[PDB]
From a paper:
The transient receptor potential vanilloid 4 ([name]) channel is a polymodal receptor that is activated by warm temperature, osmolarity changes, and many ligands. Like other members in the TRPV family, [name] is critically involved in a plethora of physiological processes like temperature sensation, osmoregulation, and mechanotransduction. In summary, we have identified the cytosol-facing cavity in the S1 to S4 bundle as a hot spot for GSK101 and Agonist-1 binding in [name].
To find a reference agonist that does not bind to the cytosol-facing cavity formed between S1 to S4, we first tried to determine the structure of [name] in complex with RN-17477. Furthermore, when we mutated the residues in the S1-S4 pocket, which lead to large changes in GSK101 or Agonist-1 activation, the concentration-response curves of RN-1747 remained unchanged.
Residue numbers in the entry:
A (entry chain A): 148 to 531, 549 to 637, 658 to 688, 696 to 764, 774 to 786
B (entry chain B): 675 to 688, 696 to 738
C (entry chain D): 484 to 531, 549 to 611
D (entry chain D): 739 to 764, 774 to 786
Write the structure that this text describes.
Amino acid sequence: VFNRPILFDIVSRGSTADLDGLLSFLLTHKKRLTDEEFREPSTGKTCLPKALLNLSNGRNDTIPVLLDIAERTGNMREFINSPFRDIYYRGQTSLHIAIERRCKHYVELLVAQGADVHAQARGRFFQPKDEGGYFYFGELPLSLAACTNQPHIVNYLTENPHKKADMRRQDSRGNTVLHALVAIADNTRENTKFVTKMYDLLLLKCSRLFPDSNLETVLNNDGLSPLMMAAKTGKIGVFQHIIRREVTDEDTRHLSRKFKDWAYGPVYSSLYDLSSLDTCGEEVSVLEILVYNSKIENRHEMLAVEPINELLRDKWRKFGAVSFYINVVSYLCAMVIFTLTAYYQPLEGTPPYPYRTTVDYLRLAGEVITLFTGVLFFFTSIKDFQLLYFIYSVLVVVSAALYLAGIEAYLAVMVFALVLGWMNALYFTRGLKLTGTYSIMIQKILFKDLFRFLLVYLLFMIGYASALVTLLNPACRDSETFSAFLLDLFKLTIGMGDLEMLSSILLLVTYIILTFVLLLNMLIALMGETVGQVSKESKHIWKLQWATTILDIERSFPVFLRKAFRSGEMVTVRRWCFRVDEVNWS
Amino acid sequence: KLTIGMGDLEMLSSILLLVTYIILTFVLLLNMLIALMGETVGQVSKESKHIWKLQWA
Amino acid sequence: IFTLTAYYQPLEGTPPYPYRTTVDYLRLAGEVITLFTGVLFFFTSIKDFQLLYFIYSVLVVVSAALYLAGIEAYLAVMVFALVLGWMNALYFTRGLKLTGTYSIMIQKILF
Amino acid sequence: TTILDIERSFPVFLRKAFRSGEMVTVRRWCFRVDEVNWS
């Protein structure tokens, strides 16, 4: 009125007599209901938002009568939609608010009046929880009705006698209702159940409306696809149902992911449809995302879903074992050849081309094999953990270059290459003999032990040294200042004992006692932490390393060569199916 | 053998990658013993109070 | 800085005021920093686990007093201050790198 | 312990405090927390 706040209070309180008098003088002053007077200077909130936020147990049946003011004001189109301007709320519309409050009557009234169901609420508060926002639902009224556990209004909005927001419509993020529904999907039981139920309903409805292309196919700007998005973001709750989706209606057969081909009583040959878990290098697949990504929080249980686990096992038995054994054996033999070439490295130095003997010819063959494997490894690395492999490749290349120069005193790089490669040997052997605790061990204690040791060791060493050189301007030395003899003395103490000093001062013994006890109890704590962490690797870590090895091998050799998983039918049941056999007596 | 069991190792040198070799082998053997202890205690679990019964039978 | 000052502690003993060199000036700056931190720690302790911190502060103060006396054979208190302070170093590092098992270890087996 | 020791260490008259809030009926130095529940 004279000031907006009293109008806002009146609309919040739901008064009508004063309110239709307000309408009266608004008619008198020819002022549009969307004027700056009715919108905040900062937020620009209209009457409708404030009225709906004050929803009193669904008793806002009157404020539509207020909205009836609009056509009298002559500005109806812009009035319904409310394009907010706050960075904290950008684009939020009255329809979003009405649907949010979990009441369908006002949603029906607004949409029937012509509410713009295609609303892109690109507000910071609407962005995912990890992008500074608080709630992401797909930035669409239909996706907002969906994500918020609101079946009836998603049905109605898709079945209203007026403009009905097509499920296909993609927001700015490109998500669509399915992607949004998996975005807020939680791994908890209630969220998982409601999300999966509504997800089924939604996909079935879209299929019935659009048999030409099921909504699963349509991707986002990222391009993941709903299943791959539930995979990349650790959404086991949806994922585990996405894999095993089988429905009833005949018109909805294609939109299933687990057929049942034949049964013989207590044996069921369930035919999973992994039409997107292995693209043969064509596009991204759930296996690549699931295994070659660490942001997942539920990797181990997400590798336990039936088709993925059985498919890893099949790729292992069929081709993984042979290729892995060939690779590891070839690596070991080639590097043993390298090691023997180093052992038989031409004596007397100066190897310009010292090979005039049969054993010399064998040595030259071994060196050629070493260079070939090194250059091939460099090619793989550049085409492609990889850190150490590339270090080995470059070291081999440099050693070969220096050797071909016929210069001396530069075999050191060759020895470095040897030692780095054999250190990679344990990385490769991880997959053999069902091993791999060693890799966990190397990535567990390595840094902590060196950190603490180096620090306290050198530290008490210098503390010792100050007083020692205080005593002597003899025993630890003959002359001059060198902490090196004191370092040697401390090594003698820690590993050897029988320590000698010029003194024959007690704080020195205190230093020794403290460092010794600290290192011993450090080893004890490392043992305890390691045993706690591993817990026999929970029987899962090795499985993840195994999957890593299998997929690495599969990607290694070209896939145009016909090494693929099972195949299947042509139409109505050309889906590259995979089989699984399970017996149940229920 | 002197290095692993005895220490007080001597060389012609008086080259660092040698010390790296020594450190890596020593740490590997120690943590190998640790892992063997852990796996043994996990496996036995006081032989689950059954293995000895099978040997007895 | 304290530890390096001890390592570079003026040779031949008798440090009345032996700083006529650039490296000597750097050593004097390090010793001044040591005394400043020691006296500040004493101020915090008197204003204020605290046991060892106060021991370090008093040891630094006594070492500074003896050094300013220009007398010899009394750097021992300085070395005591150094070792006690670095023992407090683990107490302070408890909060860094999500550590702290070491403090539990020291208060578990020691006695 | 470390956090509170640090906070007490430097003077508090320097304006390093927790969240703030309203004036009356809701001058209580409130603090906020965000939690999502699907019940």
